[PDB]
Design an enzyme around this catalytic site. Structure first.
Site: not given
Ligand SMILES: NC(=O)c1ccc[n+]([C@@H]2O[C@H](COP(=O)([O-])OP(=O)(O)OC[C@H]3O[C@@H](n4cnc5c(N)ncnc54)[C@H](O)[C@@H]3O)[C@@H](O)[C@H]2O)c1
Ligand SMILES: NC(=O)c1ccc[n+]([C@@H]2O[C@H](COP(=O)([O-])OP(=O)(O)OC[C@H]3O[C@@H](n4cnc5c(N)ncnc54)[C@H](O)[C@@H]3O)[C@@H](O)[C@H]2O)c1
Lengths: 370, 370
Positions: B146, B284, B313, B332
């Site tokens: 997603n 988050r 949530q 959400h």
């Molecule tokens: N429905 C929603 O709103 C929804 C859906 C899916 C994901 N999410 C959230 O989004 C997050 C990221 O998802 P994704 O698919 O991009 O995952 P991903 O693992 O591909 O990307 C995470 C990225 O964050 C970076 N990162 C970690 N700590 C960091 C920091 N302090 N500063 C900057 N970058 C940092 C990592 O190096 C990586 O590049 C998930 O962990 C989840 O919490 C929300």
């Protein structure tokens, strides 16, 4: 000379004493080469409210400085309006599409001194061009001034309709959570077919913004784009609107109001769309048949409709686009962001400067050269 | 075995009897070439509601066909919950971040038969990984499922905040027109400075989508992108979050919730942003300090805030993000569009198939291999 300038009312809370931000980005050019407006000076800060009565498009000190008079009013409808009462005397008339002072054949005939009609914005469908030509009146608009602003509004509205934004926002307000209520009508835009009616300044800007969403792009325009542009954007050209809309999940309308677009999206053409299509219209209200849109939303033929443009404007309280299901309407605002206002206000001045100094008005601004 | 699957409630009007659209686009892979989930069969049509209690992530037929039992509830809170009741016996726990069954260390101690915890979605911060590692419990999520969905939501929210969409829509509903009231806070996004916290699957999809809006792009990620990528997208890397937000008109948060990011956007960090900055957070809730966001919007330090993620949530009726000024919140929902659900539900089944057939779970799904 008298300049007669029609603008919308100030906010009901008073002309603003401050803004959310300190300034706006500098825009000095548009895709394809055209420069941003080039007035010799401006007497405002980009970011100020220019398009309401107190704003005056920042014109007063400039015009009065040259010994001209400037009448600014929002009162524009009927024979008793300030606009019509002052019109016989005015050499120059200016209004914006968002609050347009119509120059009908009757008004033009009354306007004994009128030599220049300026659209502060884009789209001069409120001016009778036959009448202007007959009376040697020059008609100009600020080409490109807000095309990008619109393109942004379009993408915003497409995503909001497809993803079910406003209903979901309402659950937040109502104190709920209601995930399944929100998402039983929530889709991703990715890999949907999206088509534009017209690929002019707005339509091409929309296509470019849609491209990275990984949609399949379609369009029709009377003037076909270069093959190389089609190839870079991944566009499919269709020979007609009807042919195009048959394959689109989403259709956005970005053509001017004229003979070929008046009532274009009627019951018949809407019926050719995919069931549950989304229709977005930031062009002009009358391009879509008012009641046909309502019927199609009521039947589910359209899943959603959004735009900023109505017929007439302002939309009366009872206008049925206000209460029809599955809309994401705004009033007519997209072309009048504060960002846009800075450009068309500067452009209106640039035009007035050319007029008074007897220099040619930019070719791309000219609609009729009288 | 027993599968214990927490899902969100059906819509109030019950499980959908129809949908706005006939189908959804086929998505066989993600940018970079990771394949879409590969279960042997699915027992749903992509586009159906799957993440509610009646949806069952489309797992019943499959699980019961293998002689397993599937228990589906929305009742997840506390010691007297169906979830907690059912937990002692469950070999597998499934829930989605949108309605998360939190696996705290107590609940894990209590979970005698638990060997597999699956996140139907992305981001496992509701699972205590150390307690999970202790018990050789496998923890898996449907990576990429997603990510693109969230990116679309982000661009939609940025545009809606900057252009002032929701208050303008409300003038339509209230029977007004009120052009100046709409646009006194309405800006174009074009040429603004936009920064993302993280350029992972979501962040990079956001950057790609923002590019043709002609914004100036900025980012921080713990892992700096290749130079060729920064060059292609025109990105400015900053060595920290603090360094980036000082120059940004808009900040979007796309990092996982972990010790690096918990309470990162506090009073102090927000005070370093531009006056009238826009902040979007679909990552988050806890990554931003709840009360700090409220104070900043009340003072005008933030011109607007939008996001779909909250703490806790569901958000209580009195949660202050509901009533704070200048927000564009949703519940959400972004990662649970119907389009996304088709992918994470398929990915859930793929995972279960691997578990039951003693084949390896794809490495990109694995958070803990137990
Ligand atoms: N429905 C929603 O709103 C929804 C859906 C899916 C994901 N999410 C959230 O989004 C997050 C990221 O998802 P994704 O698919 O991009 O995952 P991903 O693992 O591909 O990307 C995470 C990225 O964050 C970076 N990162 C970690 N700590 C960091 C920091 N302090 N500063 C900057 N970058 C940092 C990592 O190096 C990586 O590049 C998930 O962990 C989840 O919490 C929300
Ligand atoms: N605030 C607003 O909502 C707002 C602001 C500006 C413009 N507009 C409207 O959008 C229109 C387009 O503005 P623009 O800057 O793109 O102008 P433009 O002149 O650059 O582009 C218009 C395009 O429409 C094409 N066209 C004309 N008739 C057509 C038809 N029947 N089918 C398909 N294509 C057709 C033309 O060939 C041209 O390429 C304006 O005329 C105005 O009506 C609305």
């Amino acid at each position: 000379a008298k300049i007669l300038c029609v603008l919308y009312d100030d906010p009901i809370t008073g002309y603003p004493k401050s803004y959310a931000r300190a300034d706006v980005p500098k825009i000095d050019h548009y895709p394809g080469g055209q420069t941003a407006p080039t007035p010799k000076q401006i007497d405002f800060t980009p970011g100020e409210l220019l398009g309401s009565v107190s704003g005056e498009l920042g014109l007063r000190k400039y015009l009065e400085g040259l010994g001209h008079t400037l009448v600014v009013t929002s009162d524009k409808e009927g024979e008793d309006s300030v606009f019509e009462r002052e019109l016989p005397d005015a050499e120059i008339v200016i209004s914006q599409p968002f609050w347009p002072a119509y120059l009908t054949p009757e008004r033009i005939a009354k306007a004994k001194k009128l030599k220049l009609a300026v659209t502060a914005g884009i789209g001069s469908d409120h001016v009778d061009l036959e009448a202007a030509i007959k009376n040697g009146i020059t008609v100009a608009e600020v080409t490109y001034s807000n095309s990008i602003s619109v393109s942004e509004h379009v993408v915003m509205m497409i995503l909001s309709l497809v993803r079910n934004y406003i209903p979901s926002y309402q659950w937040v307000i109502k104190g709920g959570w209601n995930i399944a209520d929100c998402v039983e009508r929530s889709y991703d835009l990715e890999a949907m077919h999206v088509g534009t009616v017209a690929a002019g300044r707005i339509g091409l800007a929309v296509l470019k913004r849609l491209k990275p969403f990984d949609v399949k792009l379609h369009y029709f325009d009377q003037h076909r784009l270069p093959e190389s542009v089609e190839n870079e954007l991944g566009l499919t050209y269709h020979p007609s609107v009807e042919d195009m809309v048959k394959v689109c999940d989403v259709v956005t309308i970005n053509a001017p109001l004229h003979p070929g677009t008046l009532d274009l999206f009627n019951d018949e053409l809407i019926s050719k769309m995919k069931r549950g299509a989304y229709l977005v219209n930031t062009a002009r209200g009358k391009i879509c048949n008012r009641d046909a849109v309502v019927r199609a939303l009521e039947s589910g033929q359209l899943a959603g409709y959004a735009g900023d443009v109505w017929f007439p404007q302002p939309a009366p309280k009872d206008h049925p686009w206000r209460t029809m299901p599955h809309h994401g309407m705004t009033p007519h605002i997209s072309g009048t962001s504060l960002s846009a206002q800075a450009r068309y206000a500067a452009g209106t001045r640039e035009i007035l400067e050319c007029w008074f100094e007897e220099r040619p008005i930019r070719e791309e601004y000219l609609i009729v050269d009288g």
